Symmetry: D2
Subunit: 293 residues, 4 copies
């Protein structure tokens, strides 16, 4: 059974205005590449090739201009709009027709992940054909996120959205895997006191049915914060330190497509040509003639 | 006599693609605010209130959405397009009608400046009603810029554009002041071997007429580099270290307009309202009730 | 069979003078803690509790003052000096008596490692009772290190020390695992043209006997550079970004001792007391009453 | 009349333990050079050549090894110890004999300053032969420092030490200038509730005699924070961004001595020799054959 992906790349309201007045946050580069390249690359590593990008009406065309129909990276990209920022769960109403009867995965357009064995850690969620799979990650400021409580045996027993008195320091990350129940669960959701359709209600419903796998994303992964000006900066520094150390890029979509065998060496060469006079183009070229373990 | 300003915020070509595929560089934020805020604030400190923003046809509307007509900050902003990126000196052909018979100033949309007595250092160029005035700044990599050579008495005697063997480490910054000759000098320029109308030829012409002042911008000023992904990241770290230290913002246009008395406390309050729930709105508010020396 | 550890924390000569005039590099903190805490914590994760710290004669006492005999963290630390910086392999002559007839592991005092499953990746070297095990990591500037060449089947076939024309981009990291042959191999080493006893000759000898495992340390690990002022800075930024994101520390020795069960909750509490008024002390306290996966 | 300088580089207690367990904070490098180089360079710019370095008994020899007697940079450096960290005003009891009957200046060993016209701003305090002169600098967190309150005419009217409800955002920096009364005012001070002899009481006494000048250090100066591990890291990023941009170093003592004519080109060359194979030596060399305005 094939899994469809959704990147929700919608409005951060005015919270980061004026930095984000002219353009939506997920088109801003983090270091050497546009933000959206990072969650897209995540979906690609989880093996997902059919992807719906959801964003504001102003910006959809900009995302289209940047990513096209995906055919150049061996993907099949489609697009849809979120008129008003009415909750992350709204993705599933908007995405209903695109999901159809398949399994799905939702990733937040501004969430960056890095680490070892990231294929395998996604795999284990990607290969469960039933229920929902989310990830929990220790953070300093759990109040800002969805907080998962574990019992003494490490079983997930409550989820709470931006709690004033968090039950743990474990935050739900912005990567979610779902079966064919998600749309129907989404459709029955009531708005919350904040006026939002919450992804935590979606995930609570799977918990109450005993069908939520909460997999731990360990301290040895980077899950980076793009929610303040400060953190956005920390992230660029973080990526640039890795890339300049290794001479290898994090979350380069072309490279993921090439290594998954979704495009061949001739196609990778054609993608490199129009950027040949810069580092990124030069990087794509070098991938054709280097073995990387 | 009054001086008109031009901010050239055009195409950086593909040099910073794909970071810049969705949006032009000068809309990317540096730390808490869009890039273009920094040179605009510079022109404001130099006392210039009538400014032409030149940009690509695709992005003009994004600059317009961000900056409007300037009326809100006591300015008068106008807009023009640069269909093709044919050299910085092109700004004077495109800007001819807007300049009319006045004095002018040109600033690169991606140049950030910071330091003490910046009013005074601009002033001394802004007050010279005849000839041209540029600024020379010691850098490590002068080969990337226009290099000014001085004789033993500190007189400027040659200018050279991206010389392979620079005569000094003094680079010409991207702030230029000009009298009513610039348009005519611009009109007579032939494209260079690179296919560009070079600002260094413009400035050489003033030097050959003995009408170029080259004022030193000292080491105690920051002139920051936004030309690589690395330097852009250095620049955000730099502004954010200053701002978090001081609780005062660098190159905030509203604050410059308020302190120059181009807008009053009532108007500053109205600008603060629609961002009240973020740091930038809160910062504008606090300016109404703090004396800053 | 038990494995003994050596941290070589010797002289970086004058290369980073004057930053390092007053103190050896491995006592400088990286972000919140002294450099040496990082490789020490690495040895601890590999399960090694008996450790020889080797350093200059000036600085040994400072290392002793900082780390004591280890008894407080469940280790057994001993100390020895390297009079002159005559090569990394010299560690084994100096360490001969301390090694005795056991297996060993050598870590460079200035090498930082971070990532997921780091226990397991060390384990696989730690559990091989015969031969030598090193790690290879893709880097941009292989000329600076020991470069390992692989054949088309991914077999290690040459090692070369700071080659002018590197055969790959794979660098040998500064973590090494060795059987009872290392001392005797070390003793037979000739100085090189540079006047050094090279760790690459030690490792070449194991390769020529077919007893070198070269395990790949993947792009999903951080191996950080502390060899320039710039990289040292990049590292602090890197650690601080992780720690402030997670509210968990990288390479805190006390925490590793506590989680390996080498000290109990009462002892961890006593270590926290004298630092109670700062973040580090507060962090140790919080480890007593939080479950971390 | 001539002015004597004191750099207090004592115990920061345990506040930054364990980072600082092996070595006192003021020997840690900020980017390319030891911390203490920055305030020492400040005293040098203020024209002061006779300087007492006060530090802990354990570290004095490390400061001596780094700085010698100063003869190499045209200074005269002397050393004293501070057995217990009993307040910044203690510097005048300890320093009594060294001060003798001269004017003085006190600078905190961990305070970094940068900006334009820094000579002039010091000058104006250095030239006032009577009373005391301090500097007030706008900060975000004035509650951590001595806060100066101004009346509507910009006259200083109260000073308060770490007030919970600060009267302004103007913090007193860690650079102080004093006449021959300071010793006697110091001697009459009683310890505060915290067990410290406060520099703010010293400065309040001069205010109550009408002899305190409070000069504004403007926003266009950097006064950097070295009090947390975070800020220390910000400070290195900050210096390194300036230095890599300009190819000129901030607070290099040899360069200040050379430009003040306290050492000649032959002596500067001899200081450059023993570091010739690193950037800092190369930088000193290049100063012999470049004009810097
Ligand atoms: C399946 C090939 C994946 C190889 N790879 C990576 N594992 C990574 N790594 C280490 C990653 O952690 C990573 C992060 C986000 C999305 C995909 C991979 C990467 O950045 N680029 C890659 O080409
Ligand atoms: C009317 C004087 C404005 C005072 N002022 C500044 N001088 C600055 N300074 C210190 C600046 O360096 C600055 C830089 C570029 C353009 C304008 C000001 C500032 O950032 N914000 C300000 O409000
Ligand atoms: C065996 C407990 C190890 C748990 N742990 C870590 N895995 C790490 N991590 C993620 C590491 O990557 C790490 C790095 C160097 C040395 C030891 C662990 C850490 O920093 N601190 C820890 O307490
Ligand atoms: C004799 C004048 C020295 C010129 N000079 C400086 N002004 C500085 N500047 C810009 C500085 O801000 C500075 C800061 C602290 C102490 C001394 C100089 C410098 O870093 N190095 C220098 O050689
Ligand atoms: Cl982990
Ligand atoms: Cl200056
Ligand atoms: Cl990996
Ligand atoms: Cl100023």
């Amino acid at each position: 059974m094939k899994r469809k992906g959704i990147i929700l790349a919608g409005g951060s309201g005015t919270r980061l205005h004026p930095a984000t007045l002219a353009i939506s946050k997920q088109l801003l580069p983090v270091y050497d590449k546009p933000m959206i390249y990072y969650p897209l690359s995540t979906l690609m590593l989880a093996g997902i090739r059919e992807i719906l990008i959801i964003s504001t009406p102003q910006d959809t065309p900009r995302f289209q201009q940047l990513l096209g129909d995906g055919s150049n990276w061996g993907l099949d990209l489609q697009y849809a709009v979120q008129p008003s920022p009415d909750g992350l769960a709204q993705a599933f109403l908007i995405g209903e027709s695109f999901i159809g009867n398949d399994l799905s995965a939702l990733v937040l357009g501004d969430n960056l992940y890095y680490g070892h064995d990231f294929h395998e850690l996604l795999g284990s969620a990607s290969q469960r054909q039933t229920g929902a799979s989310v990830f929990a990650y220790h953070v300093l400021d759990p109040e800002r996120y969805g907080v998962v409580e574990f019992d003494q045996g490490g079983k997930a027993i409550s989820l709470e959205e931006k709690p004033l008195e968090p039950k743990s320091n474990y935050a739900v990350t912005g990567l979610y895997f779902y079966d064919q129940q998600v749309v129907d669960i989404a459709r029955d959701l009531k708005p919350s006191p904040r006026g939002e359709l919450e992804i935590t209600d979606v995930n609570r419903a799977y918990l109450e049915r005993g069908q939520l796998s909460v997999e731990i994303m360990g301290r040895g992964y980077a899950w980076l914060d793009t929610g303040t000006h400060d953190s956005l900066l920390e992230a660029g520094q973080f990526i640039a330190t890795l890339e300049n150390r290794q001479g290898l890029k994090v979350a380069c979509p072309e490279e993921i497509a090439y290594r998954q065998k979704w495009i061949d060496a001739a196609q990778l060469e054609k993608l490199a040509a129009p950027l040949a006079k810069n580092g990124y183009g030069q990087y794509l070229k070098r991938l054709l003639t280097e073995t990387v373990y």
